[PDB]
Ligand binder design. Structure first.
Ligand SMILES: [Cs+]
Ligand SMILES: [Cs+]
Ligand SMILES: [Cs+]
Ligand SMILES: [Cs+]
Length: 341
């Protein structure tokens, strides 16, 4: 009762960047790049054991396994041990954040990492992470399930474990998911009283280089959608906000970005064309509206499902981030093959 699973997935990604700062060639365009890229192929083993109280032990070990040979390591993808019962599921380990799980309803696109921002909704996804944690997922009731996830301080900051000189990087992740008749309503959010962010507004380990300490760091995602009848539409709205915790003038001052993303996907036979529009609003950094953190993105593509496990993928991405003055436009398209086992 120990299953081997995974997705192999790769393709050719062709990408271009219009960025006046990085590229001096005609009109700030990069030369168009074409590489074979992995799209996050993973290999996993997971298992269940009935413990007979209507309880199961569950565990999973999931590994990144690029077929590019990029990856190494065990457990670097959601991996956990936990007990499942009518009380729900309690898991501990390298566990996706409620937010990361919520992301499934936000970003459908497959890509290599390089096109992650342009051939998928990477930006809205920046809140999403795997955190070593304990997570409780309630049982589903009347279409309401919730997730409550905790990363203990001493886990966020191992080196600080014994002396708590560093403000706690412990985080709380919760979600409330309503799925009814193919309509899904999800609220996914994390809170970290103290956290650290990188310039790209991803959350990073404390003591990571260049990281900016933040306080009252919260992410709010509500995803509402329909997934049935061969129609897929998701509207995702994310609020990310923090008070800046960098010892400084800025300390206490607001960091805010609103991200909204929408996906409409319709299946015609085995061919499912989707488009997503994603907009990140002008962010408030240190309480100042900051159109660098702005972005607009359109991805149009389709999945040609050869089978339920196997998919061929084409997407084309157009991403514009920042204002005009310093404005990176990314274009990418990919043709890909995905196989799930
Ligand atoms: Cs993905
Ligand atoms: Cs890039
Ligand atoms: Cs991410
Ligand atoms: Cs992490």
């Amino acid at each position: 009762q120990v299953t081997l699973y995974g997705t192999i997935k790769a393709g050719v990604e062709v990408s271009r960047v219009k960025d006046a700062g990085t590229y001096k060639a005609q009109g700030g365009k990069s030369k168009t790049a074409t590489q074979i890229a992995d799209f996050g192929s993973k290999i996993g083993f997971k298992g269940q054991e009935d413990l007979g109280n209507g309880m199961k032990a569950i565990w999973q070990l999931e590994q990144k396994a690029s077929i590019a040979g990029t990856n190494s390591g065990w457990g670097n993808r959601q991996s956990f041990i936990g007990l499942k019962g009518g009380f729900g599921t309690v898991r501990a380990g390298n566990l996706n954040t409620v937010l990361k799980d919520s992301g499934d309803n936000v970003n459908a696109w497959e890509s290599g990492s390089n096109t992650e921002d342009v051939l998928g909704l990477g930006t809205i996804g920046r809140v999403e992470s795997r955190e070593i944690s304990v997570r409780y997922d309630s049982p589903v009731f009347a279409g309401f399930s919730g997730s409550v996830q905790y990363v203990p301080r001493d886990n966020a900051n191992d080196v600080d474990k014994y002396k708590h000189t560093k403000s706690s990087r412990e985080s709380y992740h919760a979600g409330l998911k309503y799925e009814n008749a193919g309509f899904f309503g999800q609220y996914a959010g994390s809170f970290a009283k103290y956290a650290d962010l990188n310039t790209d507004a991803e959350r990073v380990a404390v003591n990571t280089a260049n990281a900016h300490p933040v306080k009252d760091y919260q992410v709010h995602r509500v995803v509402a959608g329909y997934d049935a009848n061969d129609l897929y539409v998701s509207v995702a709205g994310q609020y990310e906000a923090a008070k800046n915790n960098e010892v400084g003038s800025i300390k206490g001052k607001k960091h805010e970005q609103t991200q909204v993303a929408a996906t409409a996907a319709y299946r015609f036979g085995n061919v499912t064309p989707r488009v997503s529009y994603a907009h990140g609003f002008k962010a408030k950094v240190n309480g100042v509206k900051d159109a660098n953190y702005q972005y607009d993105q359109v991805i149009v593509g389709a999945d040609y499902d050869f089978s339920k496990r196997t998919s061929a993928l084409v997407s084309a991405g157009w991403l514009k981030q920042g204002k005009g003055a310093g404005k990176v436009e990314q274009t990418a398209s990919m043709v890909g093959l995905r196989h799930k086992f």
